[PDB]
Amino acid sequence: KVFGRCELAAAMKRHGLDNYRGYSLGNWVCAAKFESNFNTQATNRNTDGSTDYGILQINSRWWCNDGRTPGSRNLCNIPCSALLSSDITASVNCAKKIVSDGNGMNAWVAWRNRCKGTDVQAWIRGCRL
Ligand SMILES: [Cl-]
Ligand code: NA
């Protein structure tokens, strides 16, 4: 599913992302835009053999099981395919675990390079929230 910007904002807000660990809604929408272009079905393979999955591009090295990342962990306790669903619940739940792990949203490379220190509120502007 390819989300609308406001549609996703509303979805994330409902799932308890707004201000989660201090990160305003705009940060999550920004991260999603640049990680996956709001596409739940986005996948990207990394040099190390791991794969990133879904709207927030969560990585199979630590967070989910895809059966093909030797010596990886499954800290979210889910198959990586569950991160590709039209229902963002699994991705949200897992992102909450990642952002609580000490490094905040810095775990998302696109957030750090393209959202951090920017006017992220702009990503939810005009939305009925
Ligand atoms: Cl933080
Ligand atoms: Na894994």
From Swiss-Prot:
Record InterPro entries: Glyco_hydro_22, Glyco_hydro_22_CS, Glyco_hydro_22_lys, Lysozyme-like_dom_sf
Tissue: In the egg white and polymorphonuclear leukocytes.
Catalysed reactions, semicolon-separated: Hydrolysis of (1->4)-beta-linkages between N-acetylmuramic acid and N-acetyl-D-glucosamine residues in a peptidoglycan and between N-acetyl-D-glucosamine residues in chitodextrins
Chain's role: Lysozymes have primarily a bacteriolytic function; those in tissues and body fluids are associated with the monocyte-macrophage system and enhance the activity of immunoagents. Has bacteriolytic activity against M.luteus.
Keyword Secreted: yes
GO BP annotations, alphabetical order: cell wall macromolecule catabolic process; defense response to bacterium; defense response to Gram-negative bacterium; defense response to Gram-positive bacterium; killing of cells of another organism
Disulfide cross-links: C6-C127, C30-C115, C64-C80, C76-C94
Taxon lineage: Eukaryota, Metazoa, Chordata, Craniata, Vertebrata
Superkingdom to which the source organism belongs: Eukaryota
Stretches assigned to coiled coil: none
Molecular-function GO terms, alphabetical: beta-N-acetylglucosaminidase activity; identical protein binding; lysozyme activity
Residues engaged in binding substrate: D101
Domain C-type lysozyme: 1-129
This protein's name: Lysozyme C
Compartments, record wording: Secreted
Family recorded in the similarity comment: Belongs to the glycosyl hydrolase 22 family.
List of catalytic residues: E35, D52
Main location: secreted
Subunit relationships: Monomer.
